[PDB]
Design a protein around this ligand. Structure first.
Ligand SMILES: *[C@@H]1O[C@H](CO)[C@@H](O[C@@H]2O[C@H](CO)[C@@H](O[C@@H]3O[C@H](CO[C@H]4O[C@H](CO)[C@@H](O)[C@H](O[C@H]5O[C@H](CO)[C@@H](O)[C@H](O)[C@@H]5O[C@H]5O[C@H](CO)[C@@H](O)[C@H](O)[C@@H]5O)[C@@H]4O)[C@@H](O)[C@H](O[C@H]4O[C@H](CO)[C@@H](O)[C@H](O)[C@@H]4O[C@H]4O[C@H](CO)[C@@H](O)[C@H](O)[C@@H]4O)[C@@H]3O)[C@H](O)[C@H]2NC(C)=O)[C@H](O)[C@H]1NC(C)=O
Ligand SMILES: [Ca+2]
Ligand SMILES: [Ca+2]
Ligand SMILES: [Cl-]
Ligand code: NA
Ligand code: NA
Length: 806
């Protein structure tokens, strides 16, 4: 119930929202069907339209008009945005040369430069270039301020998950808005685009920017707008708020546009019908900038022009139907379209089995355009599993396709030509970022970055402390002229032991054997030097990783590699080695195929044993430093040390061996040397965070050897590839992956073929940021470089995506 008999007189677009049953006059009252009876009349005036004309100049004020052109409109803060151009001989902002904004030029009473977020739905990254001829205002923002060639959205590349991640710095799994449709089994409640459930606060987690600002005494405009409020009224409203007295005036504002998404769905990303929506959004930007220039704020305000996701060509005929795969299609509920989420139609059906559904959906047709996953097996870079609203069964749909449950769903619901929601590394899903104003850099291009990083920067722009979030604060320092955030490196929590030779061979009873008892003061001193770390500067290029949790671990040095060996997990946390461009690949010699050697620096009690692998019929083992890349035949024996061994399913060994034997050297050849850090990851609760010892769900049979859920590698070389990775003077270049450690290769439909036809494709899908590995391991990398710490933070957030040129 709302008492709509109240009035909006003097309350139009009020900032504090009133509780029911009192009628509302704020920018969302329409969405709640709760506006006061006179809101349209008072607050949504339209008379005479949105532009001054010569004949209106100096007119007598008529309070009926949408906007004003009377002499008093500047003091009232309500002129039409083109007032000074038409009536006072001024230029449009778009026609002025740009000139660096070295310092804020703000009117008195302004405590800080205000921040205006101008968000555009569906605005694909390539519009900035492809549409530049029809977007002169946006083009001037882009060319004069700071811009990225694209910004990566979060998965799924849907609107509410991405707008809310912009607002919170959080992954969807953490903020709770995990799709445009959701079921929460704890609430037993459904969230839909249409309807009222979606307004309930329990869906929306984290702390969005307007709340962060409000708690720290920074006033905020209200961010969201009911769809029926025309864009011109939204701009006029922001400009009017900016004319409030100092103690009443917000410092942060948001505009939202439903275009170009609305037309992009109808016409496809590049339909000829798309020129007009782009023109219209550019005109809206022009209104804002002209309005700011009228208020003398155009060199005071920081403007962010930002998109939530792009838009791909998708038509009804490219739909896969689950009815063509599943016998039991009526026992499932599917959330359909550009992603699939499956759960049981009824929780009372004890014949529902996720394994049989996954198997019926796995590589069943040659050109199959989706791939099923249990959510914990999705690429860790998607960060898309740790929420009860995300169904266990996920379908990753190929770009340009849809999945649906039955054909009748698609013609009894062709209409549309565009859609979005695909994997966030897909080039069509990329979106835009431009920052313009005194706090951003002038005429500066910055590399692509993820939208999770923006909340921290918006907080820096407003002098706010960000709530805990998934950005890496400081990684976007290079966008900013001032207000940078100068993080310190985290303190190491555990210091390593450096064991020397402490055990005799006969103390070990590991069931291992090795043909290594075939035997010199020239070489003996030298092998002792290697074990004390004489080659460590070649193999550990960026300092040792720091361990940011309490554990007991040993540093182990060798000729060709260094490792941090966990006495708790019985294996390295990390192994580091450098492979120069000139390195040679060798084989594992016949006499050494089954060799595993006790490590006389590490007690039998803190070692793996070979007998556990012999008896575990599903589990085999691999090596972190690859025997294939040993520097010499003698050095190769170190690679078969029990402290270099890790548990590996035979199917996974196919992947790993190919990586080690073929790909590492390929990357060293291409990149002029690589440094590799590799290791296990344990994330049995799929939260993105390192598991403690009591969270481990699987061990090598009969032992205390934990089985990793994933294996990572971080491959670093010199950005200037004329310099070898081990003698690099400037910026670094990185790529990394987090491979799932699975007992089959059902993910790779072509896995019966030679590894050269499928392994690298698998690795690219599982591409990762260093930061993802840090969260997953409790390690902190690149601790000793010659680079600024914010530059290293940027490097740690990098994702190598393998997509062609945008
Ligand atoms: C991305 O960044 C984010 C933000 O930093 C990271 O998320 C944080 O990670 C922490 C660890 O997972 C987590 O800390 C926990 O907080 C618990 C209290 O939580 C509430 O309070 C906070 C603060 O205001 C609030 O933000 C939370 O919001 C979550 O939950 C509500 C629903 O109530 C949602 O609306 C909201 O969207 C959000 O959901 C997300 O997180 C929760 C977990 O909190 C998930 O369940 C959801 O799936 C979703 O992803 C909460 O309202 C606190 O109680 C926890 O402490 C337990 O464990 C510690 C171990 O140290 C132990 O000392 C405690 O005793 C306690 O154990 C007891 O409870 C156990 C479980 O019931 C039980 O097993 C034990 O036996 C004990 O009884 C813990 O400290 C923090 O809350 C989230 N924050 C957010 C916003 O998500 C995220 O990790 C980053 N991601 C990556 C990849 O880096
Ligand atoms: Ca859309
Ligand atoms: Ca975990
Ligand atoms: Cl969805
Ligand atoms: Na075995
Ligand atoms: Na396969």
């Amino acid at each position: 119930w709302t008492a709509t008999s109240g009035s909006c007189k003097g309350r139009c677009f009020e900032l504090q929202e009133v509780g029911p049953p009192d009628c509302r006059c704020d920018n969302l009252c329409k969405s709640y069907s709760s506006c006061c009876h006179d809101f349209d009349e008072l607050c949504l005036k339209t008379a005479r339209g949105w532009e001054c004309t010569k004949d209106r100049c100096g007119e007598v004020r008529n309070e009926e008009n949408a906007c004003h052109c009377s002499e008093d409109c500047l003091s009232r803060g309500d002129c039409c945005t083109n007032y000074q151009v038409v009536c006072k001989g001024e230029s449009h902002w778009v026609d002025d040369d740009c000139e660096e904004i070295k310092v804020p030029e703000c009117p008195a009473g302004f405590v800080r430069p205000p921040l205006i977020i101008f968000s555009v739905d569906g605005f694909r990254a390539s519009y900035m270039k492809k549409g530049s001829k029809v977007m002169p205002n946006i083009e001037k923002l882009r060319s004069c301020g700071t811009h990225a060639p694209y910004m990566r959205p979060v998965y799924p590349t849907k609107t509410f998950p991405n707008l809310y991640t912009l607002a919170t710095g959080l992954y969807p799994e953490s903020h709770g808005i995990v799709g445009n449709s959701m079921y929460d089994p704890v609430f037993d409640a459904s969230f839909h685009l249409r309807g009222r459930e979606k307004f309930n606060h329990r869906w929306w987690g984290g702390q969005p920017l307007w709340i962060t600002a409000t708690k720290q005494g920074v006033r905020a405009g209200t961010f969201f707008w009911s769809v029926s409020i025309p864009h011109e009224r939204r701009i006029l409203t922001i400009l009017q708020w900016l004319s409030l007295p100092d103690n009443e005036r917000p410092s942060v504002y948001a505009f939202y546009s439903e275009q170009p998404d609305f037309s992009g769905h109808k016409y496809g990303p590049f339909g000829p019908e798309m020129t007009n929506p782009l023109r219209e959004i550019d005109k809206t930007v022009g209104q804002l900038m002209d309005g700011l220039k009228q208020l003398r704020l155009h060199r005071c305000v920081n403007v962010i022009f930002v998109g939530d996701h792009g838009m791909e060509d998708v038509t009804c005929d490219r739909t896969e139907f689950l009815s063509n795969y599943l016998t039991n299609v009526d026992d499932i509920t599917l959330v359909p379209g550009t992603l699939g989420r499956i759960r049981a139609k009824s929780i009372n059906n004890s014949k529902y089995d996720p394994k049989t559904i996954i198997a019926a959906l796995t590589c069943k047709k040659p050109d199959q355009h989706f791939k099923p996953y249990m959510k914990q097996h999705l690429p860790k870079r998607l960060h898309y599993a740790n929420n009860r609203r995300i169904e266990d069964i996920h379908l990753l749909v190929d770009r340009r396709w849809h999945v649906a449950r039955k054909p009748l769903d698609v013609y009894k619901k062709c209409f549309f030509q565009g859609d979005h929601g695909f994997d966030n590394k897909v080039n069509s899903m990329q979106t835009v970022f431009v920052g313009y104003g005194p706090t951003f850099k002038y005429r500066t291009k910055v590399p692509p970055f993820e939208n999770i990083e923006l909340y921290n920067v918006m907080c820096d722009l407003l002098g706010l402390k960000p709530a805990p979030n998934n950005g890496t604060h400081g990684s976007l320092n290079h966008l900013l002229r001032t207000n940078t955030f100068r993080p310190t490196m985290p303190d190491e929590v555990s210091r390593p032991n450096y064991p020397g030779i402490m055990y005799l061979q006969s103390e070990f009873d590991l069931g291992c054997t090795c043909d290594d008892k075939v035997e010199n003061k020239l070489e003996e001193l030298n092998k002792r030097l290697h074990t004390k770390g004489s080659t460590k500067e070649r193999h550990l290029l960026y300092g040792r990783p720091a361990v940011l949790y309490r554990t007991s671990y040993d540093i182990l040095y060798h000729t060709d590699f260094e490792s941090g060996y966990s006495e708790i997990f019985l294996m390295p946390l990390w192994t580091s080695y450098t492979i120069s461009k000139q390195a040679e690949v060798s084989s594992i010699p016949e006499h050494l195929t089954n060799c595993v050697r006790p490590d006389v620096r590490v007690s039998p009690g803190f070692s793996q044993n070979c007998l556990a692998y012999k008896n575990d019929k599903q589990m085999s083992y691999g090596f972190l430093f690859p025997p294939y890349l040993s520097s010499s035949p003698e050095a190769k024996y170190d690679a078969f040390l029990v402290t270099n061994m890790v548990p590996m399913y035979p199917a996974f060994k196919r992947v790993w061996a190919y990586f080690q034997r073929v790909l590492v050297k390929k990357y060293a050849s291409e990149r002029n040397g690589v440094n590799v850090i590799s290791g296990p990851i344990f994330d049995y609760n799929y939260d993105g965070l390192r598991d403690t010892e009591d969270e481990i769900k699987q061990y090598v049979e009969g032992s205390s050897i934990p089985v990793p859920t994933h294996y990572y590698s971080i491959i670093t070389s010199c950005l200037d590839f004329t310099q070898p990775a081990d003698k690099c003077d400037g910026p670094l270049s990185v790529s990394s992956f987090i491979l799932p450690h699975r007992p089959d290769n059902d993910e790779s439909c072509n896995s019966s073929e030679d590894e050269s036809k499928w392994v690298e494709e698998l690795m690219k899908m599982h591409t990762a940021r260093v930061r993802d590995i840090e969260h997953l391991t409790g390690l902190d990398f690149y601790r000793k470089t010659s680079r600024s710490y914010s530059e290293i933070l940027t490097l740690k957030t990098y994702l190598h995506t393998y997509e062609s040129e945008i």
